[PDB]
Design an enzyme around this catalytic site. Structure first.
Site, PDB file in Angstrom:
ATOM      1  NE  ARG B  10     -23.481  -6.374  18.992  1.00 41.88           N
ATOM      2  CZ  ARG B  10     -22.567  -5.559  19.194  1.00 41.88           C
ATOM      3  NH1 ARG B  10     -21.416  -5.469  18.423  1.00 41.88           N
ATOM      4  NH2 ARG B  10     -22.312  -4.879  20.431  1.00 41.88           N
ATOM      5  CG  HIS B  12     -16.245 -12.388  21.492  1.00 43.42           C
ATOM      6  ND1 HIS B  12     -15.001 -12.132  20.659  1.00 43.42           N
ATOM      7  CD2 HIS B  12     -16.456 -11.279  22.439  1.00 43.42           C
ATOM      8  CE1 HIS B  12     -14.840 -10.898  21.270  1.00 43.42           C
ATOM      9  NE2 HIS B  12     -15.358 -10.445  22.180  1.00 43.42           N
ATOM     10  CE  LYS B  38     -21.792 -40.416  -2.545  1.00 46.09           C
ATOM     11  NZ  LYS B  38     -20.595 -40.081  -3.262  1.00 46.09           N
ATOM     12  N   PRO B  39     -26.713 -41.475   0.705  1.00 46.14           N
ATOM     13  CG  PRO B  39     -26.360 -43.741   1.527  1.00 46.14           C
ATOM     14  CD  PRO B  39     -26.663 -42.691   0.547  1.00 46.14           C
ATOM     15  CB  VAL B  40     -22.147 -40.169   3.586  1.00 40.74           C
ATOM     16  CG1 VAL B  40     -22.853 -40.379   4.707  1.00 40.74           C
ATOM     17  CG2 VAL B  40     -21.485 -41.235   2.703  1.00 40.74           C
ATOM     18  CB  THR B  42     -16.656 -35.707   1.098  1.00 34.70           C
ATOM     19  OG1 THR B  42     -16.944 -36.361   2.572  1.00 34.70           O
ATOM     20  CG2 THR B  42     -15.496 -34.594   1.815  1.00 34.70           C
ATOM     21  CE  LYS B  63     -11.900 -45.178   5.341  1.00 31.93           C
ATOM     22  NZ  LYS B  63     -13.107 -44.210   5.295  1.00 31.93           N
ATOM     23  NE  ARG B  82     -23.189 -38.656   8.924  1.00 30.76           N
ATOM     24  CZ  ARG B  82     -22.780 -39.719   8.512  1.00 30.76           C
ATOM     25  NH1 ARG B  82     -23.835 -40.605   8.121  1.00 30.76           N
ATOM     26  NH2 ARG B  82     -21.699 -40.143   8.297  1.00 30.76           N
ATOM     27  CG  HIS B 116     -12.622 -44.479  -4.045  1.00 28.46           C
ATOM     28  ND1 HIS B 116     -14.083 -44.753  -3.888  1.00 28.46           N
ATOM     29  CD2 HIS B 116     -11.898 -44.727  -3.021  1.00 28.46           C
ATOM     30  CE1 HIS B 116     -13.952 -45.146  -2.535  1.00 28.46           C
ATOM     31  NE2 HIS B 116     -12.965 -45.011  -2.183  1.00 28.46           N
ATOM     32  CG  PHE B 117     -13.347 -38.304  -1.017  1.00 27.14           C
ATOM     33  CD1 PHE B 117     -13.698 -38.882   0.175  1.00 27.14           C
ATOM     34  CD2 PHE B 117     -12.699 -37.247  -1.197  1.00 27.14           C
ATOM     35  CE1 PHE B 117     -13.280 -37.898   1.347  1.00 27.14           C
ATOM     36  CE2 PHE B 117     -12.191 -36.395  -0.103  1.00 27.14           C
ATOM     37  CZ  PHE B 117     -12.611 -36.926   1.307  1.00 27.14           C
ATOM     38  CG  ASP B 118     -10.479 -45.095   0.761  1.00 21.62           C
ATOM     39  OD1 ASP B 118     -11.147 -46.045   0.342  1.00 21.62           O
ATOM     40  OD2 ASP B 118      -9.578 -45.535   1.577  1.00 21.62           O
TER      41      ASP B 118
HETATM   42  O1  LIG Z   1     -18.127 -40.356  -0.798  1.00 20.21           O
HETATM   43  C1  LIG Z   1     -17.627 -39.564   0.284  1.00 20.21           C
HETATM   44  C2  LIG Z   1     -17.395 -40.663   1.407  1.00 20.21           C
HETATM   45  O2  LIG Z   1     -16.251 -41.378   1.044  1.00 20.21           O
HETATM   46  C3  LIG Z   1     -15.906 -42.167   1.966  1.00 20.21           C
HETATM   47  O3  LIG Z   1     -16.889 -42.844   2.455  1.00 20.21           O
HETATM   48  C4  LIG Z   1     -17.219 -44.036   1.330  1.00 20.21           C
HETATM   49  O4  LIG Z   1     -16.340 -44.789   1.013  1.00 20.21           O
HETATM   50  C5  LIG Z   1     -15.652 -45.616   1.961  1.00 20.21           C
HETATM   51  C6  LIG Z   1     -14.373 -46.356   1.306  1.00 20.21           C
HETATM   52  O5  LIG Z   1     -15.140 -47.208   0.247  1.00 20.21           O
HETATM   53  C7  LIG Z   1     -16.795 -46.689   2.491  1.00 20.21           C
HETATM   54  O6  LIG Z   1     -16.023 -47.363   3.542  1.00 20.21           O
HETATM   55  C8  LIG Z   1     -17.899 -45.534   2.888  1.00 20.21           C
HETATM   56  O7  LIG Z   1     -19.002 -46.601   3.479  1.00 20.21           O
HETATM   57  C9  LIG Z   1     -18.423 -45.063   1.883  1.00 20.21           C
HETATM   58  O8  LIG Z   1     -19.398 -44.081   2.153  1.00 20.21           O
HETATM   59  C10 LIG Z   1     -15.191 -41.288   3.175  1.00 20.21           C
HETATM   60  O9  LIG Z   1     -14.752 -42.217   4.262  1.00 20.21           O
HETATM   61  C11 LIG Z   1     -16.431 -40.401   3.594  1.00 20.21           C
HETATM   62  O10 LIG Z   1     -15.984 -39.515   4.905  1.00 20.21           O
HETATM   63  C12 LIG Z   1     -16.974 -39.643   2.451  1.00 20.21           C
HETATM   64  O11 LIG Z   1     -18.100 -38.580   3.098  1.00 20.21           O
END
Ligand SMILES: OC[C@H]1O[C@H](O[C@H]2O[C@H](CO)[C@@H](O)[C@H](O)[C@H]2O)[C@H](O)[C@@H](O)[C@@H]1O
Lengths: 124, 121
Positions: B10, B12, B38-40, B42, B63, B82, B116-118
């Site tokens: 409780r 720690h 949408k599969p993943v 952030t 990437k 996810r 775009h989030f890469d």
């Molecule tokens: O959308 C959030 C995710 O963004 C990245 O993953 C996506 O974009 C990458 C670069 O185009 C792809 O390789 C990947 O397949 C996509 O899912 C990021 O790498 C993830 O961590 C984020 O959750």
């Protein structure tokens, strides 16, 4: 038509409010875990690893406890933890803490059968 | 009488693995579950100004090779979503994981802002 910039804000931005900010994690947890009931506990540490990983420390590196006993153990690796320290303006029953997330080895004292953690001695 | 082991838990323990329904709700409220799950994803928890400032931080390759990606100099509070194995449209379900990591975004435009989030690293 939604702009690329607005699509990124919709998909990815959710800035935390102040009550929901990690800076307030300690204020919430120290209260919910009943560590501010009778007075403010000065310092405390929460461990975010699994209970299995924390219980395992009792069979890791034996080190001396701050109090002098020898039933303390240090984890071989660092763990994800949050350190809570009372703020200078803190004053029971309005306890207030600064929150610091870190990655450190922990040291706990163990006792019992099974031999498990019963006191958190230090982070390092 | 609470046992010594229980008192330790409780005082720690706050194990992160089993905002638990955060992703479930944010994915649906931001329209990321409308026709399919949408599969993943952030989400970033810093201010919008702090995220936009990344577009003038460390320039790195995306990437896919594009040269308009930028990595934050500092780590940022983010949450990764996810899809779980039970997830199935229209009952999409997600696991929520909080982290503090550097983010990488691709920027474009005038003003130059993230589009775009890469990655997070
Ligand atoms: O959308 C959030 C995710 O963004 C990245 O993953 C996506 O974009 C990458 C670069 O185009 C792809 O390789 C990947 O397949 C996509 O899912 C990021 O790498 C993830 O961590 C984020 O959750």
């Amino acid at each position: 038509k939604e702009t690329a910039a607005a699509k990124f804000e919709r998909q990815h931005m959710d800035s935390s409010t102040s009550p929901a900010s990690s800076s307030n994690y300690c204020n919430l947890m120290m209260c919910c875990r009943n560590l501010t009931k009778d007075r403010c506990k000065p310092v405390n540490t929460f461990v975010h690893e699994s209970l299995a990983d924390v219980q395992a420390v009792c069979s890791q590196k034996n080190v001396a406890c701050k109090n002098g006993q020898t039933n303390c153990y240090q984890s071989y690796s660092t763990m994800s933890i949050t350190d809570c320290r009372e703020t200078g303006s803190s004053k029971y029953p309005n306890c207030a803490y600064k929150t610091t997330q870190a990655n450190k080895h922990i040291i706990v004292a163990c006792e019992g059968n099974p031999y498990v953690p019963v006191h958190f001695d230090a982070s390092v």
